[PDB]
Design a binder for this molecule. Structure first.
Ligand SMILES: COc1cc([C@@H]2c3cc4c(cc3[C@H](Sc3nnc[nH]3)[C@@H]3COC(=O)[C@H]23)OCO4)cc(OC)c1OC
Ligand SMILES: Nc1nc2c(ncn2[C@@H]2O[C@H](COP(=O)(O)OP(=O)(O)OP(=O)(O)O)[C@@H](O)[C@H]2O)c(=O)[nH]1
Ligand SMILES: Nc1nc2c(ncn2[C@@H]2O[C@H](COP(=O)(O)OP(=O)(O)O)[C@@H](O)[C@H]2O)c(=O)[nH]1
Ligand SMILES: [Ca+2]
Ligand SMILES: [Mg+2]
Ligand SMILES: [Mg+2]
Ligand SMILES: [Mg+2]
Ligand code: NA
Lengths: 36, 440, 418
């Protein structure tokens, strides 16, 4: 059970970092709208 | 009655299993289709070889064995190999994704997907037994499956079979024969986890076997096939008392009484002789005295260590072939006046002898010469801790930098398991020191 | 049945991708029409790692070709083996990237990416058990570098537990296409450090110097460079493709710390086993412009191919370690592994390929970092990138990360056992 929680939490952290990259890529394209 | 079930885990365990079961068939006169013409009781019986083989009504003699690996390609060669007909398809179990040299994946991520199936197949074998004696588990220390899945299996076997005996044949890693860099981690982890679940474990140092093949058989670079044929001869020597009977035969369980003075001190040192090429065996007959003498030569040990620098707590000689006790006793009398055989002060110094009369066989077209008599010595010497020291040192080198530890943490493990396993090894090494110290 | 999915992105990625497929197709006995005409069952035993089996007993590369321009990809369809690729696996835009990482990563590349991921998913779902992915691409351009790292990240969201392996061509002024290459490379390294498991550093400066100095080629073309790339790529994939290796076992044994996953590949010859071993470890044979005598080896893998004494391979591999032990970190015991494959590459009786994790790879990243810092100190050419939505802190972030990488390789180079 401990091993299952640990590994799941590592995957969750990984996907959360990847989804923060998605947010930043939207702020970048929105930031391009605001200079056109 | 007295059945033993063999379990072969990962590539090492499976390939050694191939070699062992081939050798058993040759020793017993069982053909590759499983027919045994000498066996007149069709479909059953209580013969000595029935401890290792069940029988179908169609005359087939079937290994009491399960082969398990988390990838398919090594067991597939069994499924398609010479002895494919020996085994029922259900005895050969494979996953699709191996453990990638990672204990954590063998014990947890991948292993947990197949452990229930493996246990269900073992239960199917156990149910055919009238008096199951225990398990023989074959595996490497170093692979992800051999280390991690084996520990999981052993833990589960203790739950499902209580204190029913479990013996291991464990392949100890050597750089010569291929080897992942993380094998010291896998070795300590599996040794720590299995320690309380195993009753007796025969370590086999791949470097020892490699050296014996190069030196005695004159093979420049031994293959796995070379190593495993030699290993199967040692396994066969050790299990011969289970599979044959005779007036001078002594059951492995009686040796085990002598070999295990404390639960954790359960790692006997095996030595085997003689190992000789056909060219050298021709016109040379090795006597009882000659082969006995060879057991006390360190070059013939299954594990590299120096017993001259430790103390004995037991010495067992398992003879097979043309050997009578008179020649044994003389040979031992000679040995005891010419060798460094120092016992601990709390244990008797006799050698325990058994003789199995059925002579040794070899695989036709192999490199081992057929001899008329052979011997395997099993001793319990504090010197075997040198093997743990060597492995603990490689562990410590890597662990102090946490090298590769992220591959195990990524699979859900914690550093806490590393230090707890390493501390258990440190206590094991101290256990071996304490038992060798003279009594007050 | 441990499938790899291959992705080639951009001009460089597609050109070396196409050579790679020609080279290993020849090795496995596959012709441009996809039919097997080989002479050894060892060519087909693991063919499924890289190829799909189709109707008519045809074999199709499990490959995906990606570019923001039709140019290179039309050349691929025309060249040799052009019609062995699955036509639905071509995914091309129209606008191009302009050698602008931000265009490949955020803008143009971002609205082509979803259609690439549809092909990735189709290829992955027919896989009995996917190992992971390998991407070929350059870091100096815009499509392979910017959209390639975008693909890596997006694939990591759907396959977080699969291996990501890249062949990443590093830019050199000796072959320089543009001037902003140190920007595109540094932004790309930033992503690679975080989102790949293993990266072969194919350094155009090494390839140039090899072609010029050793091969005696006064005007090296991309054809001459790529010939080195293809032989290297064939060499480092040998153990994946013939019946000891897979991508995860490779990463487990080569990568002691997750960020230190940039490998220096080596090849010989550019003939006896001692001679071959010697040349494989020589700085002149490195596919990355780094001198291994200026750092220390964390891990090493060597593949010998051809019929030769394995006892002599063992003795010479032990020889080069014992005589150079100071160059191998003591706290990773037994850190050099050797494999032998009977089947030589085309045109050689024997060959040696080298995969090294050396702390000397820092010389590569330090060269890029100085070319980056020289332009960023004067804010040169930044408008190309802020013009797509980026801000300077992302440059400041990317270069700090790459300097941290250098510091980390240095920290382990300097670390001792006692
Ligand atoms: C796919 O490419 C290779 C990878 C490895 C690599 C690999 C790479 C290594 C390493 C170990 C190991 C291990 S070796 C092993 N043998 N038994 C269990 N594990 C494993 C095995 O399979 C592997 O794939 C691992 O130490 C330093 O670098 C090695 C190679 O050749 C030596 C190959 O060279 C091309
Ligand atoms: N004596 C002997 N050793 C072997 C054999 N096969 C592998 N080994 C050794 O076993 C260790 C590696 O473990 P393996 O059994 O191959 O690995 P595994 O159990 O299949 O684990 P994974 O492949 O990681 O899932 C190394 O020390 C190898 O040298 C063999 O047939 N005979
Ligand atoms: N080795 C090699 N390098 C290349 C090749 N084509 C382009 N390059 C290099 O790749 C970089 C340019 O990236 P490129 O792939 O052409 O741009 P992209 O199409 O936007 O990805 C420059 O550093 C070129 O030197 C090739 O076929 N082989
Ligand atoms: Ca003779
Ligand atoms: Mg395996
Ligand atoms: Mg270009
Ligand atoms: Mg390879
Ligand atoms: Na019978």
């Amino acid at each position: 059970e401990s091993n299952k929680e640990n590994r799941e939490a590592h995957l969750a952290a990984m996907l959360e970092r990847l989804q923060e990259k998605d947010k930043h890529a939207e702020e970048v394209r929105k930031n391009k709208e605001l200079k056109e | 009655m007295r059945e033993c079930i063999s379990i072969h885990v990962g590539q090492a365990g499976v390939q050694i299993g191939n070699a062992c079961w081939e050798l058993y068939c040759l020793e017993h006169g069982i053909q590759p289709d499983g027919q045994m013409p000498s066996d007149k009781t069709i479909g059953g019986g209580d013969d000595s070889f029935n401890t290792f083989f069940s029988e179908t009504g169609a005359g087939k003699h079937v290994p009491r064995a399960v082969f398990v690996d988390l990838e398919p390609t090594v067991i597939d060669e069994v499924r398609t190999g010479t002895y494919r007909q020996l085994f029922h398809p259900e005895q050969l179990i494979t996953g699709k994704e191996d453990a990638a040299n990672n204990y954590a994946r063998g014990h947890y991520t991948i292993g947990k997907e197949i452990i229930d199936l493996v246990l269900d197949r073992i239960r199917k074998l156990a149910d055919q037994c009238t008096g199951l004696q225990g398990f023989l588990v074959f595996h490497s220390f170093g692979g992800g499956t051999g280390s991690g899945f084996t520990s999981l299996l052993m833990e589960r076997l203790s739950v499902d079979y209580g204190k029913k005996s479990k013996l291991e044949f464990s392949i100890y890693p050597a750089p010569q024969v291929s080897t992942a860099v993380v094998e010291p981690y896998n070795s300590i982890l599996t040794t720590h986890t299995t320690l309380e679940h195993s009753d007796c474990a025969f370590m086999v140092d791949n470097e020892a076997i490699y050296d014996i093949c190069r030196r005695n058989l004159d093979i420049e670079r031994p293959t796995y096939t070379n190593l495993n044929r030699l290993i199967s001869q040692i396994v066969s020597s050790i299990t011969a008392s289970l599979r044959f009977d005779g007036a001078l035969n002594v059951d492995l369980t009686e040796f085990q009484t002598n070999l295990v003075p404390y639960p954790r001190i359960h790692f006997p040192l095996a030595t085997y002789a003689p190992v000789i090429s056909a060219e050298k065996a021709y016109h040379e007959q090795l006597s009882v005295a000659e082969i006995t003498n060879a057991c006390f030569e360190p070059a013939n040990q299954m594990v590299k260590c120096d017993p001259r620098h430790g103390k004995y707590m037991a010495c067992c000689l398992l003879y097979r072939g043309d050997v009578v006790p008179k020649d044994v006793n003389a040979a031992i009398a000679t040995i005891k006046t010419k060798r460094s055989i120092q016992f601990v002060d709390w244990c008797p110094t006799g050698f325990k002898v058994g003789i199995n009369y059925q002579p040794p066989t070899v695989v036709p077209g192999g490199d081992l010469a057929k001899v008329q008599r052979a011997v395997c010595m099993l001793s319990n010497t504090t010197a075997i801790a040198e093997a743990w020291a060597r492995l603990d040192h490689k562990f410590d080198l890597m662990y102090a930098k946490r090298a590769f530890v992220h591959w195990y943490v990524g699979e859900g493990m914690e550093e806490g398991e590393f230090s707890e396993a390493r501390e258990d090894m440190a206590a094991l090494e101290k256990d071996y020191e304490e038992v060798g110290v003279d009594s007050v | 049945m441990r499938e790899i999915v291959h992705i080639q992105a951009g001009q460089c990625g597609n050109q070396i991708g196409a050579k790679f497929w020609e080279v290993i197709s020849d090795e496995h006995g596959i012709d441009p029409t996809g039919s097997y005409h080989g002479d050894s069952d060892l060519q087909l035993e693991r063919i499924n790692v890289y190829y799909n089996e189709a109707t008519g007993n045809k074999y199709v590369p499990r490959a995906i070709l990606v570019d923001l321009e039709p140019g290179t990809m039309d050349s691929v369809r025309s060249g040799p083996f052009g019609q062995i690729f699955r036509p639905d696996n071509f995914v091309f835009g129209q606008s191009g990237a302009g050698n602008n990482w931000a265009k490949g990563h955020y803008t143009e590349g971002a609205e082509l990416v979803d259609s690439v991921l549809d092909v990735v998913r189709k290829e992955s779902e027919s896989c009995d058990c996917l190992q992971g992915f390998q991407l070929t691409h350059s870091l100096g351009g815009g499509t392979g570098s910017g959209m390639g790292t975008l693909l890596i990240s997006k694939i990591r969201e759907e396959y977080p537990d699969r291996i990501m392996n890249t062949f990443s061509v590093m830019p050199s002024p000796k072959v320089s296409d543009t001037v902003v290459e140190p920007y595109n490379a540094t932004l790309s390294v930033h992503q690679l450090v975080e989102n790949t498991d293993e990266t072969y550093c194919i350094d155009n400066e090494a390839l140039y110097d090899i072609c010029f100095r050793t091969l005696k080629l006064t005007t090296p073309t991309y054809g001459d460079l790529n010939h080195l790339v293809s032989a290297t790529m064939s060499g480092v994939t040998t153990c994946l493709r013939f019946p000891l290796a897979d991508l995860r076992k490779l990463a487990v044994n080569m990568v002691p710390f997750p960020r230190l996953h940039f490998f220096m590949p080596g090849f010989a010859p550019l003939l006896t086993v001692p001679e071959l071993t010697q040349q494989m470890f020589d700085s002149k044979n490195m596919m990355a412009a780094c001198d291994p005598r200026h750092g220390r080896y964390l891990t090493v893998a060597a593949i010998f191919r051809g019929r030769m004494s394995m006892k002599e391979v063992d003795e010479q591999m032990l020889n080069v370690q014992n005589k150079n032990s100071s160059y191998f970190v003591e706290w990773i015991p037994n850190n050099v592994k050797t494999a032998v494959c009977d089947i030589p590459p085309r045109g050689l009786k024997m060959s040696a390929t080298f995969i090294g994790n050396s702390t000397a790879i820092q010389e590569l990243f330090k060269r890029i970092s100085e070319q980056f810092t020289a332009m960023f100190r004067r804010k040169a050419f930044l408008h190309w990138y802020t013009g797509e939505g980026m801000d300077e802190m992302e440059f400041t972030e990317a270069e700090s990360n790459m300097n941290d990488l250098v510091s980390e390789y240095q920290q382990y180079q300097d670390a001792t056992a006692d």
